[PDB]
Amino acid sequence: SIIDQNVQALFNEISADAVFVTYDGQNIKKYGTHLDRAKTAYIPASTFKIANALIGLENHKATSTEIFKWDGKPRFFKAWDKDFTLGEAMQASTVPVYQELARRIGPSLMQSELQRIGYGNMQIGTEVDQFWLKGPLTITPIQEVKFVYDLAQGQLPFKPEVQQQVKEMLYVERRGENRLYAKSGWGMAVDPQVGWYVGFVEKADGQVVAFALNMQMKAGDDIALRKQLSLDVLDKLGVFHYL
Template sequence: MPQSMIANIVARTSLVVLLFWPFPGAAVADTILDREQFTGDIGERQSSFLALDLTSGARCVLAGSDLETRHAPWSTFKIPNTLIALETGVAESIESWRDWDPKLRPAAHYWPDAWRQGQTLQSAFQRSAVWYFQDIAVEVGAPRYRDLLSDWEYGNADVPTGSDTFWLGGPLALSVTEHVHFLERLLTGALGVDDVHLEALTRVAAAGNLGAFKLYGKTGSGPAQAGQFSGSFEGWYAGWLGQDGKVAVVFAHHARGAHFSSIRSFRQDFAEVLLKACGYR
């Protein structure tokens, strides 16, 4: 992470505003991060962020965030899609291998070399290899996706019959709040996902450390206007923090910038800055 983005986090945290929001039971103090303290980091980008502490129920929000507008999940959909592949038996494990068929899945101009080869479920997740998950989408089928995503309260659960790209630009879409809600329910056991499959997801989503916490997550991005790769891009970083073998925090960061390079690193780097400003360090 650039040093300029992590400097003065402690000072920034001291400028946090505490508000009270209605939660069932006792009131819980939410942390609202003053956006003006991060103008140097955000620049001309749009940035919306929400974190939920699973122990206290407190939220940490970047002031001025749009938490309710829905956006395509892009490659963050690999979090539920990996679980769906395992839960339905389309993939037996994260080691399930698929050969790349360039005739069936011809490489687009933007494909990195790492996509242009066979993959396991784990490598496809970590390399964000789209074609592997397109194959999974065909085998799972729209009816099973719609049923599972509706049960999981994953955004609008909109999966058209016959589509193998429904998470890339839509019509599947969810808000920052819905993203966090899904991760909360998933990681607290409310969705009934097999523990073995959750452990597999934890392995593939591991992203290093954030201070005293283990960081897990997935990026995702795509052109804000379909097919306009030279224009503005939107993107996500969504995941969770673990400590002492337990999930402590779930979060989602949505960003938009003038081009892909403006959000490529920013999606995750700024999410980490905000998590530290929330007190998770």
Template sequence: MLALLLVAASLLPLPSGLIDKAFHGRSGAYVQIDVQTGARYESDARASAVKVAPCSTFKIWNSAIGLQLGLVASPDAPFWKWDGVKRDVAPGWNQDQTLRSAFAVSCVPAYQALARQIGKVRMQEWLDRLGYGDRDISSGVDVFWLPAPNRKTILLSAVEQAELTARLARGDVPFSTRTQAELKEVMKVQSTAKGTLYGKTGTGTDRGTRIGWFVGYVVSGGKTNAFACRLEGDGVMGTDARKAVESILAGQGLL
């Protein structure tokens, strides 16, 4: 009986129907962790354990490593000089970037340049220290998080994503206090009267499945909840996952 009570105490209750409403009939997974107590919610335990490419959510950790190594001076210092290549996929990439602006527009070439500066050896060391997914960067230091046909990416689950952001939120990561503070500043998405949202989207097609990520945490009422949302389906984007998370958090009165 005691064991059953302990298991029950570890569950984070969410209002009925909240996930279905937010997902709009799409498949995927949502994980939420109370950073203070460790209580958690998983919309679908099997789906939450499926490992896929992180896509641009890896920019959270690419940013942290760059800041920690001194390769990025600060969130608003010059970060990447535009190479002059016009990229129609994202017009916001066609300009010089700070870390803050590159994170906001998810500028892939800027972060690829940072990954090359970090280098394979140091990147592997940091991912090992973080315990990031399956830690496999064999496809290349500047592409291992980006899914593409015939490319083996690093893989991690929604549970692992949420656990990592929970560690970040409580300061249980191998980065300096300054790095963590600057990273959180860059990750800030929005503030409302009820809470402040931090996170990063990611979009891609992994092994034939279109996925949209949004991972991060929310601070509300003196409490912090980490989360990871992965949606799947034709045309799905990271922005769809973000909207789903905002709906779920608003339904709990956290945003």
């Protein structure tokens, strides 16, 4: 089809190894310049915030209303030097807030929860607030896509209201009836560095298309390339048309 050519020609300009996986609940589809990335495991980086919020809410370690207060120590971004709810920190990808959450869960409960839900290789190592940024936790694009697909559907092994709350923490924008939810990632501490843009498009019809961009990153890259490439792809596929 011509839509496949349109999508592949998008990647034919990107000077970085990339894969974009889709999942409509039945078919996995892969596009990009290196399809084998879809089956390769990378650290989740900030996409792990999804599982971290789910585990923390499920296990009475935080609420979606609770305020995670700034402790006064300057964070990496001046924008992070304030108080956040888990929702607000999800949109800002505020790493220190989610590290505080991981420490509340603790390594024993984090480990057993990741085994219970089967998230990636389920390895956390010995630093409970570092494993998704430096390893040893890894996950494939195919695994990320089926994970967030189930989140959209309320079919993860979590309480239904916990999934609903984390689902709307991911809410980016709606276009007419169709809703985009997404979370970006950039694992800089590993080699190669890995970039993520994972999420799903919910139609008012109820159909869901989950997606995961996974691409190699270099220091200095355009931080906005992950989201703009994913939205380009979704429009060319006719999943999430530009308005």
